[PDB]
Ligand binder design. Structure first.
Ligand SMILES: Nc1ncnc2c1ncn2[C@@H]1O[C@H](CSCC[C@H](N)C(=O)O)[C@@H](O)[C@H]1O
Ligand SMILES: O=S(=O)(Nc1ccc(Cl)cc1)c1ccc2c(c1)CN[C@@H](CO)C2
Length: 257
């Protein structure tokens, strides 16, 4: 918790979204696999509506590339002021923003609608109406007077919950907490670290709750979801870089009610 105070966005970004973990050329990498999961899910046309909320966005945008064309009102969030500012830098095309163009181009490539990557980033930037502070540890994650439309038609969260929970029980609560923001029948797209206990973000050393696919599955069910899809990407040896001890990555498409 207080460890997130030393959390450096730039260090987080190069540890996870820059080579080798960031390479998108090899189809066997984690990046290609994750964008595929997201793109395919939205391609079924079943995950749709008007508003969407991204839980604990951190300083990344890749988790919304395929999503942005299905929701006109997008709300991004994060606990740390520093991450919200890193997002602004990219959203406002300000100086020193992280370059996600490779991810955009790959999203367009995977989506196969012949869209150019500039049009993709243009649309995402347009639909992101706000970058709000948030705390999944609060029964009301966003708060009282949330400028964000509620209940949202859909939610997206990547690598957040397990990274802010010390144990399985906390994980469940945080999931119950954010679940309240979702409209019954709505959809949840959850991505996270499998069996990880720590990860570095510069001077910050964060503790993580090691979870398994079945634990995630069971937790989604407990929060009142109907697991539409749950996949696992096992982390290959060469993506084991010393920035954490993650064993794999999971993708979950869950529906509320
Ligand atoms: N109590 C809390 N509630 C919500 N988010 C929190 C939190 N404590 C920390 N976080 C945020 O959770 C994130 C975990 S890292 C995941 C970042 C991004 N979603 C990605 O896919 O890479 C960080 O951005 C961190 O600032
Ligand atoms: O899968 S990754 O190795 N990198 C990646 C993810 C998605 C795309 Cl699209 C590209 C690269 C990746 C990304 C974020 C985090 C990890 C791994 C593991 N640690 C979590 C925080 O606990 C945070």
């Amino acid at each position: 918790a207080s460890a997130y105070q030393r959390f450096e966005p730039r260090a987080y970004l190069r540890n996870n979204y820059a080579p080798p973990r960031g390479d998108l050329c090899n189809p066997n990498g984690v990046g290609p696999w994750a964008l595929r999961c997201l793109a395919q899910t939205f391609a079924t046309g079943e995950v749709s509506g008007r508003t969407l909320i991204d839980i604990g966005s951190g300083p990344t945008v890749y988790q919304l590339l395929s999503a942005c064309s299905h929701f006109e009102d997008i709300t991004m969030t994060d606990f740390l002021e520093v991450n919200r500012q890193e997002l602004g830098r990219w959203l406002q095309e300000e100086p020193g923003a992280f370059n996600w163009s490779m991810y955009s181009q790959h999203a367009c490539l995977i989506e196969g609608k012949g869209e150019c990557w500039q049009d993709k980033e243009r649309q995402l930037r347009a639909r992101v109406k706000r970058v709000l502070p948030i705390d999944v540890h609060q029964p009301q994650p966003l708060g009282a007077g949330s400028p964000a439309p509620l209940p949202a038609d859909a939610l997206v969260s990547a690598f957040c919950l397990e990274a802010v929970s010390p144990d399985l029980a906390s994980f469940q609560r945080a999931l119950d907490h954010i679940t309240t923001l979702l409209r019954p029948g709505g959809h949840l797209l959850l991505i996270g670290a499998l069996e990880e206990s720590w990860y570095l973000a510069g001077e910050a050393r964060l503790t993580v709750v090691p979870v398994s696919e079945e634990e995630v599955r069971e937790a989604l069910v407990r929060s009142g979801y109907k697991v539409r899809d749950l996949r696992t990407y096992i982390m290959p040896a060469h993506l084991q870089t010393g920035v954490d001890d993650v064993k794999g990555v999971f993708f979950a498409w869950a529906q509320k009610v």
